[PDB]
Design a protein around this nucleic acid. Structure first.
Lengths: 121, 239, 267, 58
RNA sequence: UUUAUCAUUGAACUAUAAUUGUUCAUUGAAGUCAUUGAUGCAAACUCCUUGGUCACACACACAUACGGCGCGGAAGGCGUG
């Protein structure tokens, strides 16, 4: 889908990407990751869960496929019953804009620590 | 036109623009009542000789009242002509017993009689005049439809214009027994309500507490009425 | 105006009489005063309302009692009443004529041919409801039909409109009584005020009476709600509604047909 | 933009822009914010006080 | 296009079943709503979020197939300090 996912990136670098994560059933969840852990428990913002019916599976066996989509919103999915994750869609704001946003967050956090040091005195 | 059923049947077969196709998922229920059974049986045997068993079915009652019987006539997967024929025959027969006891013809309709009747249809209808719908029906599932004061040809034309516009579909399988149980339940409720009619005074209203609950209140209301009459007399007095 | 002031944080030994003495008769005139006590204990919660007629006297009392010694504590007599989108609607009044009175139940009839009697005019307006008098002015070709109910007057106007009495079309409207018409004529001859008075009510609620119900005629009444309990008599007093009312009405209408076939009454 | 759109739009009319001062728009937006929050917090409570004497109110 | 509960008995009954099948009913345990329901098929209309809605010109190039020799932005590969 001409996204060109990064060639040397991991889960700390794939954050806030619109993932298309596959499970053991095939119940594909599409949404933005915002956190993970050692067991790969993924929170998913604006997530949608898509499946294929049993009648559509005969047409899928060797065209249009009518998938069943349900809307989950902000969910938190476990890492046991998942199989694979890919990157489907890029986020809204770019890498330089995320860098400027992270510098603003660091400056705001340093200002908050200076405010806590001023309130402690 | 004429007063014969078969001539209007030929006319409604002729100029209704290929009306031989029936309606997919079509159902009609006509509950009727007869005073006697023996006169009904010959007309119903002639109807079963004319109309097949798969299209039309009949359902008797349980003989609870022993005087007024209740017979269901269920037309299932019917065409537009057989519906008009069955409704014309039954609407002639359930009024010929009161108007013409000496005519003695189960398929010849006289001129002095007007066809006026009531038939149920399922709720899943789509219409997108003499036959009207009803407001405040008594059946939870079905819709009652009324025809009033028509001749034979007007009855044929109005029933054909009604069934040419309505669209049926996807009826429940044993909905006939459901309608039987609901109809018997509703009319057993109103029969019990008529049974409650002599039991008004002193029977089941707890009169011994109801007198003492309203004994000062009606007295104070009567005092208010006497004060109202006296104040009205003072208001209308010139003096 | 009825300005309200809310006194708060009062002591326990302060009844409504002490609050009425401290509120009224001190450069003001408090119309009402009530201390909000407990629902089941009877003790005062320390709060009370005082409603006065004038707003200036209540404002002066709230300005003078702000911090006054009230049974060993403060009075706190600041006002309770007086940017949201939702406000209650407010209206003026139609100055109380005989059209805009909802209790006005007497119908002015006109357009008569000066030929109908009083009993016949009673017979025109009898089944619409109970009635009190059917007197008409002489030489004025008009009259007055006063009922008890207002729905009976609505039914009488909605039915009797456009009905020709003795080859003469009727004119139905509202109007006052004879004494109020004499008062309006006495106040209009000098043209000083010409003010009217509202017709008195029914002192509602009234459980027993059923509107638009007539009865012409011991009584063992069960007072059941499906039937009728009390009714106004036909001249007048209050009668208990018996069970043999439709029988007496049927005998009365058969007697009326028998006496009207011959000519003993025209009504 | 297109040429004929410019000859059509610049000849029809010229509309008037309304605008307010700082304290006026501040007071109006504060009243609109309190109206939005009082509409977000309110709800219709007519059925509770309209069936108050009903036998199944308890 | 496809489904919308079983069992005992009564008046007939096809019948290897816990009378299965046909018409009517008493009773017994749970008893998805949905039949305008569910699946498949297919077209048209409308509305939402995104962009460089950018700088010059409305132009005759190419077998080594296309002068990728403008100012940038978004994603990525390779190389150097």
């Amino acid at each position: 889908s001409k996204i060109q996912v990064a060639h040397s990136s991991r889960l700390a670098n794939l954050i806030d990407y619109k993932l298309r994560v596959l499970t053991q059933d095939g119940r594909v969840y599409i949404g933005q990751l915002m956190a993970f852990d050692k067991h790969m428990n993924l929170v998913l913002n604006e997530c949608i869960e898509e499946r294929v019916p049993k009648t559509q599976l005969d047409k899928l066996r060797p065209l249009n496929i009518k998938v069943e989509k349900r809307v989950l919103g902000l969910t938190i999915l476990r890492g046991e019953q998942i199989l694979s994750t890919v990157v489907e869609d890029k986020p809204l704001l770019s890498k330089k804009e995320r860098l400027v946003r992270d510098k603003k967050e660091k400056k705001q956090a340093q200002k908050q620590t200076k405010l806590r040091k001023e309130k402690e005195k | 036109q004429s007063f014969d059923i078969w001539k209007n049947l030929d006319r409604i077969r002729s100029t209704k623009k290929n009306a031989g196709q029936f309606i997919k998922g079509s159902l009609l229920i006509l509950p009727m009542r007869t005073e006697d059974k023996q006169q009904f049986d010959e007309c119903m045997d002639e109807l079963h000789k004319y109309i097949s068993k798969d299209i039309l079915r009949c359902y008797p009652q349980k003989e609870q009242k022993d005087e007024g019987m209740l017979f269901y006539i269920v037309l299932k997967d019917f065409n537009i002509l057989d519906s008009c024929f069955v409704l014309s025959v039954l609407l002639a027969f359930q009024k010929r017993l009161w108007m013409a006891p000496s005519e003695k013809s189960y398929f010849r309709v006289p001129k002095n009689i007007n066809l006026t009747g009531s038939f149920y249809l399922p709720k899943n209808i789509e219409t997108g005049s003499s036959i009207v719908e009803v407001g405040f029906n008594v059946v939870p599932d079905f819709q009652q439809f009324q025809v009033k004061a028509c001749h034979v040809s007007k009855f044929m034309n109005e029933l054909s214009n009604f069934f040419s516009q309505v669209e049926f579909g996807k009826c429940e399988a044993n909905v006939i027994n459901y309608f039987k149980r609901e109809y018997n339940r509703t009319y057993s409720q109103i029969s019990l309500a008529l049974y409650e009619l002599p039991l008004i005074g002193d029977g089941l209203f707890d009169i011994k507490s109801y007198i003492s609950k309203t004994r000062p209140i009606i007295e104070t209301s009567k005092a208010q009425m006497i004060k109202h009459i006296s104040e009205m007399k003072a208001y209308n007095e010139i003096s | 105006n009825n300005c309200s002031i809310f006194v708060g944080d009062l002591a326990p030994n302060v009844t409504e009489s002490q609050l009425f003495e401290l509120f009224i008769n001190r450069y003001a005139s408090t119309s009402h005063a009530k201390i909000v006590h407990d629902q089941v204990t009877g003790m005062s919660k320390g709060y009370g309302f005082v409603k006065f007629t004038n707003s200036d006297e209540q404002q002066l009392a709230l300005s003078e009692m702000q911090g006054v010694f009230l049974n060993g504590r403060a009075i706190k007599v600041g006002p309770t009443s007086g940017m949201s989108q939702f406000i209650y609607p407010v209206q003026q009044q139609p100055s109380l004529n005989h059209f805009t009175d909802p209790n006005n139940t007497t119908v002015f009839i006109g357009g008569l041919s000066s030929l109908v009697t009083e009993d016949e005019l009673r017979a025109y307006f009898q089944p619409f409801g109970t009635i009190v008098y059917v007197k008409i002015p002489v030489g004025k070709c008009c009259g007055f039909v006063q009922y008890v109910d207002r729905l009976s007057a609505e039914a009488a106007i909605a039915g009797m409109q456009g009905f020709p009495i003795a080859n003469s079309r009727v004119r139905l409207s509202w109007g006052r009584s004879a004494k109020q018409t004499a008062l309006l004529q006495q106040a209009m001859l000098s043209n000083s005020l010409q003010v009217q008075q509202q017709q008195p009510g029914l002192q509602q609620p009234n459980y027993g009476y059923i509107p638009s119900s007539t009865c012409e005629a011991n009584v063992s009444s069960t007072m059941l709600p499906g039937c009728q309990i009390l009714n106004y008599s036909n001249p007048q007093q209050v009668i208990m509604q018996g069970s043999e009312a439709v029988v007496n009405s049927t005998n009365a209408m058969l007697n009326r047909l028998e006496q009207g076939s011959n000519g003993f009454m025209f009504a | 933009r297109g040429r004929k759109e410019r000859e059509n739009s610049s000849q029809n009319e010229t509309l008037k822009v309304t605008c307010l001062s700082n304290k006026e728009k501040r007071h109006i937006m504060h009243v609109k914010k309190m109206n939005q929050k009082e509409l977000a917090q309110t709800s219709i409570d007519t059925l509770k006080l309209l069936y108050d004497g009903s036998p199944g109110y308890s």
